Symmetry: D2
Subunit: 451 residues, 4 copies
């Protein structure tokens, strides 16, 4: 099958906000559900994806040279749902003439560059139904009978990133799959020299143009992003003096041990979801080291080894080209001085220390997943009376007042539901299976008519 | 699609001798070629497989506990030809409800027990076209016009392993895929206590019945089979005294390094085949350590570690429970004595040493691949005049005198062609791709009519 | 030098309670301080060690086959203080004729069996100054002038483990290095079938005598001890049905990552000690995963793999020979029934489940380090007024009222000071350096006279 | 003890030619034999070492960034002889304040930079007895009674590398420990752009000065040196186009498997030496993959991975920045052209291909160990009549006619005796033990007088 485009003016069955991996997994699952080769029961649903980037890209600001996936390739966008799918990583390799060559690597962990290209190869097959350069700015409730008190569609308004014009599309069902936004410490001032990890590859080279210059560059944080940037900077700027600032005492290893890791299994979502709010909070805390503020062991070991080599060359740590400053917090940033370097004031992170002069501060402090709140502000009144937070059901559809919203209309959330669905929610871990679940939840009636 | 059985009395399009992995890969490729889901161009060919075992089994005498595949699961019976195939290892796992669980192991190397079950799961889907308990004993030339000098079919005669009756099936094309036979040193006498590695799991427990008894058991050889048996015996018979006898100075590691390993790539068969006899002989020798008389490093290290632990317990090697005797050869076996133990006489393997008294000698000396010669003795006269060896073309069809044999008739060899096709010939390495190549070579005309 | 014995009746310079690794490291450091070859400045101090075991043994109840050290051999009993010492692991190997052979293993982690033998080899060299089979039962204050209010020696009373007779030795200085006692859940009743991990190898075989019998054996806990026992039982009793009961959701991996692991460095003791009580408590919690309720990754992976193999054989987890039951707690133990099996009642560990019938319950719930409290009850009054807990100084000497105790008398604690000295206190990590520090603290005046 | 210098004019007991690791191990063993702390039996022997380098350096032309030892640190210059020695790698680390830090790396394989510094630290302690900048040019026989026919000393003549003046020293005993000389293919012409691997770090940067320039650089060979240079060039010159030319089909992995590796054990020298010439030749061939024309697996895998990444970026191998050209041999080098690039003509190495234009050719073709022949030309007549090759005894002393040479005079060879003493001869493997053996062989009489 081949998904054809729907004219902008027609009522859509589904409109998806964002075309990152989460939305792409839904597109793939729909294709597969409509394929007679895979689904024996298999008109076309009217679907559109809106993506603010001008083309498909996966965390392009963090495509650090040599960076690797932290998940088995088997957990791609189709395999766990159907290994026979044309959208598996192995079939992508076969199509590229690279399958035997990848096999000879004996690794489950492709370069992030390669995995992005896999997803790009998948994404390109849906170009007819994806509108790029469209930033969704609001979702507005709609009534086919404006005199009634029942909402039965939604209008999704997006802004063209190049022209700035506003387009509207109407749909019975909306999916919001917009990932996360850069989290910045509230104490830090705004400055072109202060840059979030998410914009590392895309904006730092424009600030620090000469790769041979002895720049002083600090990195704030101790998670995977902070470690990757710290390590890369030492290769990208060979004569630089880099400094890793962390409030913890040390970089800590990610837990990928097999029993613990079973929390990422697709079948575990049912189990997690059915737990109480207290139990879910308890569970997420207990398993935090699988995902948050943690670094892959291999990378920790490499950075440690690099530090040891500095010790061999010079026993005085204060003279090392690259340094780590643990149990520190930034208390003041001077950035109005005549020189191109900022002055960073540090204290102990325990409940006055040194001063650093730097050309740039990379801030690897993670992400927030609350941007859907702003997009859904105008539909908040459709929630049950007195409810001031969106409550996703197991099938990811948000709860709305049944007396206010028709059964045929709804809004689903994707990627922002860790609190209710578990640690796998924001990752690639369950995307293949979740895509299949989403297609059933959204298009079930049509698929049942064929079944 | 589903391959239906052909009545014994009808002329077959293809008859395959053996239903091990090589024949199974052909069955799978044919299924896939006939599947409209995978091949858009896709009556049924008349096909039968004859297998001497009573059911599908893969080296059952060597299904040693804990034994592992020495090849990536990606090199299964379909993936390298088509990752979308229902016969991939990953789809097998999915069907069994085990895919996520295998993923969590982070290994490319399943237990041999698991891989056999994968192949058994594949094999069971062809039960309608496989006759088990049928040992093929001869291939006889046939002439549709007996007064002419042109052969245009073959009669394949098989012996029922239970009843002993002789059945005949006629076919235009024959494939011989019968693997290897046990290679035994010519100096060794016949004795129930002298057993080839291929019969280890199936016959040794019948000889040495009490698992707690202090048996003396020797193992001859230094390849993967010898190492696996040596290591297993120490677990199976905890109180036994085992001795590894080898003519080499040491167990040597298998070469699985990535550049060298590319010799096993499916596309390399073309390159190898087109080389001269001298070059091919040279090439096979240079790369011998990838496959022959070699042990997986991990297993060498485990055995070595076990030996070290014996040293900790006792510094006198002569007192060790389990011993390795390198650079030795057996010169005499006494096995007519009144006691249940044989007397093995050893000398240096260099161009008189000790004596061992043992309850059993496991002989792990490898395999010969010449059994097709006996089966094809009655068709030898169809080869070009003066040719006293079978010459497989690139497509595995043996050369026959075109003035004696019709273009529609032929015999293909599988698994015994290392001399012409390379080190991957006897392994699982190229089976998926080779199956596809075989289906084209044998059924091409029919498939072209559909294409 | 060679430490000669002191007659029981003479006033000792030092008496050490316990001859485990901590006391042995002090003996070694004293030898080394007195050796002219190592210390250029170098009468004999009057010293005695009292050990309740009949000979040197290191956690003999947990010398599980195949069990390994969780610390580099470089952190032996001398190397970190002086690599030239005759008491290094490498010199032990050299003396045994095993150095080259160990080198060829390429491991930093010897078998626990080997490391015990290293320590036994060290211990045997101090046989003249160690009294075995002597259980210290009390430390009594002594006054050379009984009419005065100043304590200037201590009497250490011990009970002969064979004869039961009481011996007394007088000393100016005492070291208490008695390790830990078995920690048992308070809810469990006393029963010969309920056995702590510390008595696994020494007492379980006496209870379950027939190694081939299909016993049901449970294990309580999820730390290294629980994992080792769980794994071993499956080898020791091949036909048994084992069950691992844990309150956590999963076995979690030990953190041995290099930055975090620096907390075990000898120089870090100064840093840890100088922190506030609050900071120390915070620090110990943050780094808990380096030592407590954690399993070596390799062992987790092996157990996981064994579980997967059960899945291959049978997809129904309830039928598996060996099982893990996570998030469970024991609420009732029935052990008065006519059968030889106890009935264990389980519930969820979250704030009624199944029932198990077992022949034995192995309880791997860790250790307490409070036994010094009982031994020092009669000297408690020498602490500063109102102080109801022993307060070790940096040099491990407990604080006593200077107006009550002479400067030449004192009591040191070893191995029970994690709260004040850090996570390395109970381990082998800092023993070499700590031994040297202890010798200076205790014998400094004599050593200064030579210096 | 401290070895004092001998005036140039005095008769020496020993003169050693070369102060690389082999001579340094002798110096260390002598120190240790004379140390009362280690040898209880312990005037000073008159000794001098002559070294052509201006200071101690270990293969400085191949101190490639990130390069690692291929041998356990335990096989340092003392440990296998005496772990108590002050000259062990661990004691070096302790002295540098780095022991705990190295321990935390969990590696047996220090950087070559670190190991050189270890050896430099050892070497500096013998500065009084080492004359640097002295290139030995000949050994001349000497007779204390010139009218007699008996040689009883040797004169060693050396050339000052700075002034060019000739100095002579007289000695009863000589050791030649001069390592190897650069082996170059005889077909290659002399050119500043054609450089042996041994001069990579020291001379290539002087030829290719701009690290950012898009140079074309070829590497000839497929051993460890060729792989290290190939890999490093890609980092040193990021915009370069590198090409690895090899006559073999692939880089092959070094055999470091534990049983095979036992050939490097010090005790194995006795066993190897006592074999016949035929057996020794056979043995060296069988074990070639442990040392010659082989690459460490880890490095092969890294290079392979780098090649795969090029494939991801571009499926056309001809466009890759860095390429490997297997089964090739150089037949013509054009190097008289007006451009700065040479033209290299390649053919198949099998019994016309492409053309490469390159700025430099690195030639990693190994070493010869025959330079002692030139130095000993004037003493050849002292060998038994008709003997045209030097024959080292087990103790490394060359055979001389007893009627021509006094028992108190002799010449020993070190590092060039693989044919007679085995594969460990040229390596660090047996240096500690061999040093001890050499001290006994040379100074035994003096040491026996003390014993
Ligand atoms: C550097 C990095 C590496 C990672 N690597 C891994 C890994 O190895 N394995 C793993 O499982 N997880 C990984 N993750 C986790 C990651 O969250 C998932 O891989 C994945 O990106 C989640 O997909 P998503 O579609 O939910 O969110 P995203 O990938 O963020 O996609 C959301 C999309 O919505 C678009 N969008 C946002 N706002 C709007 C708007 N208003 N209108 C229109 N479009 C909009 C964005 O442009 C984006 O394309 C990584 C995360 C980071 C930051
Ligand atoms: C113990 C062991 C482990 C191995 N593991 C691996 C591995 O991990 N990876 C890998 O790539 N290679 C491995 N191999 C190599 C092995 O040769 C292939 O895996 C595979 O078995 C080859 O398949 P085949 O069909 O050519 O031969 P076989 O597997 O031997 O199958 C031939 C079949 O023909 C039947 N047969 C024989 N004679 C007759 C007759 N006269 N009439 C009818 N039927 C007959 C036999 O019963 C058998 O079923 C292993 C080999 C051994 C011995
Ligand atoms: C199974 C196990 C394995 C371990 N493995 C490691 C490892 O790999 N690495 C590591 O660093 N740590 C390990 N540890 C931590 C362990 O605590 C230390 O290795 C070490 O045992 C501490 O030595 P110690 O002398 O302080 O205590 P102990 O080893 O317990 O020694 C105390 C001694 O005092 C004796 N004693 C007790 N009471 C009396 C009395 N009243 N009178 C006389 N004598 C008495 C005891 O018999 C004992 O010999 C392990 C612990 C366990 C339980
Ligand atoms: C790049 C490289 C890396 C290696 N790494 C390892 C390793 O990891 N492990 C290992 O076991 N082996 C290794 N080797 C093997 C190596 O041969 C030994 O490590 C070691 O160098 C042998 O020591 P030697 O003293 O015999 O020879 P050399 O190290 O070559 O020392 C000989 C010395 O004699 C001097 N000399 C030469 N001619 C004269 C003269 N006419 N007069 C005066 N002085 C002279 C030289 O300047 C030199 O200092 C490596 C070899 C190379 C090339
Ligand atoms: N940060 C990525 C975590 C991936 C997870 N361990 C999984 O297997 O799904
Ligand atoms: N449980 C033993 C921990 C040992 C510690 N990682 C150390 O290196 O000292
Ligand atoms: N090329 C160095 C080889 C070192 C050798 N495997 C050894 O252990 O001595």
């Amino acid at each position: 099958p081949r998904l054809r485009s729907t004219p902008q003016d027609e009522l859509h069955d589904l409109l998806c906000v964002g075309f990152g991996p989460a939305s792409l997994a839904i597109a793939i699952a729909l294709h597969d559900a409509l394929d007679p080769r895979l689904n024996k029961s298999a008109a076309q649903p009217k679907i559109c994806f809106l993506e603010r980037q001008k083309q498909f890209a996966w965390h392009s600001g963090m495509l650090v040279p040599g960076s690797k996936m932290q998940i088995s390739f088997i957990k791609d966008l189709a395999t766990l749902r159907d290994p026979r799918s044309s959208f598996t990583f192995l079939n992508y390799l076969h199509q590229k003439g690279r399958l035997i060559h990848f096999t000879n690597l004996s690794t489950f962990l492709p370069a992030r560059l390669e995995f992005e290209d896999y997803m790009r190869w998948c994404a390109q097959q849906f170009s007819d139904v994806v509108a790029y350069g469209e930033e969704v700015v609001e979702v507005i409730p709609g009534k086919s009978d404006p005199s009634s008190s029942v909402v039965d569609f939604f209008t999704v308004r997006s802004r063209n990133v190049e022209t700035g014009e506003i387009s509207a599309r109407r749909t019975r069902k909306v999916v919001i799959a917009i990932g996360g936004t850069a989290k910045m410490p509230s104490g830090l001032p705004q400055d072109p020299r202060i840059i979030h990890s998410s914009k590392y590859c895309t904006t730092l080279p424009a600030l620090l143009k000469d790769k041979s210059k002895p720049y002083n560059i600090a990195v704030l944080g101790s998670g995977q992003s902070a470690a990757e940037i710290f390590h890369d900077l030492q290769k990208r700027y060979p004569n630089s003096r880099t400094t890793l600032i962390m409030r913890d005492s040390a970089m800590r290893p990610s837990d990928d041990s097999p029993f613990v890791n079973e929390i990422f299994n697709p079948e575990r979502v049912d189990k997690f979801y059915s737990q109480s709010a207290a139990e879910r909070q308890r569970s997420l805390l207990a398993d935090k080291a699988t995902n948050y503020s943690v670094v892959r062991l291999e990378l920790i070991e490499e950075i440690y080894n690099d530090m040891y080599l500095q010790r061999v060359k010079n026993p005085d740590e204060t003279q090392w080209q690259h340094r780590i400053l643990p149990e520190r917090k930034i208390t003041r940033v001077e950035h109005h001085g005549p020189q191109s370097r900022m002055r960073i004031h540090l204290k102990s992170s325990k409940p006055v220390k040194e001063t650093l002069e730097v050309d740039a501060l990379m801030v690897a402090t993670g992400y927030n997943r609350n941007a859907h709140e702003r997009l859904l502000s105008k539909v908040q009144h459709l929630r049950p009376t007195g409810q001031d937070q969106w409550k996703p059901h197991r099938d990811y559809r948000v709860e709305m007042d049944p007396s206010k919203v028709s059964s045929e209309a709804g809004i689903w959330l994707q990627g922002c539901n860790e609190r209710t669905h578990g640690l796998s929610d924001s990752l690639l871990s369950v995307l293949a299976v979740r895509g299949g679940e989403m297609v059933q939840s959204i298009f079930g009636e049509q698929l049942e008519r064929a079944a």
